[PDB]
């Protein structure tokens, strides 16, 4: 049931950075374990990753800099609701 989303305005997409959004009521400790688990599984496949931030308070999840090749693996992590590729916002 975990889905992937990316900006429909192709020039505004920022590939290589993803927001992994976990299910409502996933705890900070569970989000940190999920982030460590992605880093371990990606490293076994020869991929370098970086956890940029761990979210809690509004949405549980984390911000990760990694190759999009890892998205099928990341969607199978526990607690995942969806993953969204980062994108630009602009002053109006």
């Amino acid at each position: 049931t975990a889905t992937f989303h990316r900006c429909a305005k192709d020039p505004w997409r920022l590939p290589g950075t993803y927001v992994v959004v976990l299910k409502e009521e996933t705890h900070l400790s569970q989000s940190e374990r999920t982030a460590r688990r992605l880093q371990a599984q990606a490293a076994r496949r020869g991929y370098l990753t970086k956890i940029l931030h761990v979210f809690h308070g509004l949405l549980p999840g984390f911000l990760v800099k990694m190759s999009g090749d890892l998205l099928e693996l990341a969607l199978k992590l526990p607690h995942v609701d969806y993953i969204e590729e980062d994108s630009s916002v602009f002053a109006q």
Binding site: L59, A91, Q92
Partner: protein
């Protein structure tokens, strides 16, 4: 003689409300906003591809500036989510929204209004974070977008829990901005003055410049919300929305400016302060 937009919304308030601003850097010692805006340590901006603080300084002035502000008694807190070119990221904005909620839990104050004078494409995650912050009791006001398009295709404009503000000019008509202009459609809650808005210019400590955009229009609604919540602090988000519609000028926009299918969907409302 007063700036047209300040006369348009009038048929030092807002002192009980804190307005958070997620924007570029701000020239906090400009005479128009000195002592009114507290710059947080928050910064989350992408690298670039007197001008760095132009956008945020003007908007801080629209909300609470000494001479040209809407809610002159409101206090503001600023977070830098837009770089020198006015560009940010959805993740940077998410981290900023989380920072506001963390700040509030650590040291609660009165009603909070969050001004988001920015837009990107439709974002499931930015809409969900806005929805969660609004459900947590915080009021969010955002620019409808300056793309002459349906606001439902942009975020945070498309989030239903956010007050989405389009821009009107001195003829009460939708603002044109170059070849584009204000967004419209069913995701817009109301319009507010957003053309030739006089406000603090970061070029010098006493300079003023006029700017146009849905960010200026959203800043007007953030100021009106601050005045409304200060007068009636117990208003829920649904009640605050009812008040904004109630005190708005009705049916003065010529709906022919919108595309044919958007005429029945776009609210014909121009924001104004209660009498």
């Amino acid at each position: 003689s007063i700036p047209w937009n300040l006369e348009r919304i009038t048929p030092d308030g807002g002192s009980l409300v804190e307005v958070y601003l997620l924007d570029t850097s701000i020239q906090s010692d400009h005479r128009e906003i000195e002592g009114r805006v507290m710059v947080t340590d928050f910064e989350n901006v992408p690298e670039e591809d007197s001008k760095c603080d132009s956008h945020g300084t003007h908007l801080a002035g629209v909300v609470s500036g000494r001479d040209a502000g809407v809610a002159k008694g409101a206090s503001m807190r600023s977070l830098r989510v837009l770089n020198c070119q006015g560009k940010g990221t959805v993740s940077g904005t998410l981290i900023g929204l989380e920072f506001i909620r963390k700040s509030q839990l650590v040291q609660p104050v009165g009603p909070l209004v969050v001004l988001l004078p920015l837009a990107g494409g439709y974002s499931r995650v930015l809409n969900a974070a806005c929805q969660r912050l609004a459900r947590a009791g915080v009021v969010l006001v955002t620019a409808a977008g300056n793309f002459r398009d349906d606001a439902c295709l942009y975020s945070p404009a498309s989030a239903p829990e956010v007050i989405t503000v389009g821009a009107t000019n001195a003829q009460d008509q939708p603002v044109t901005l170059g070849t584009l202009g204000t967004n419209f459609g069913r995701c817009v809650d109301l319009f507010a003055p957003g053309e030739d808005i006089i406000g603090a210019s970061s070029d010098c400590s006493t300079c003023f410049v006029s700017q146009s955009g849905t960010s200026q229009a959203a800043a007007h609604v953030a100021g009106i919300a601050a005045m409304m919540l200060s007068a009636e602090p117990e208003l829920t988000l649904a009640e605050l929305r009812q008040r904004l519609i109630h005190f708005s000028a009705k049916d003065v926009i010529n709906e022919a400016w919108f595309p044919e299918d958007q005429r029945v969907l776009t609210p014909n409302l121009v924001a104004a302060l209660p009498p």
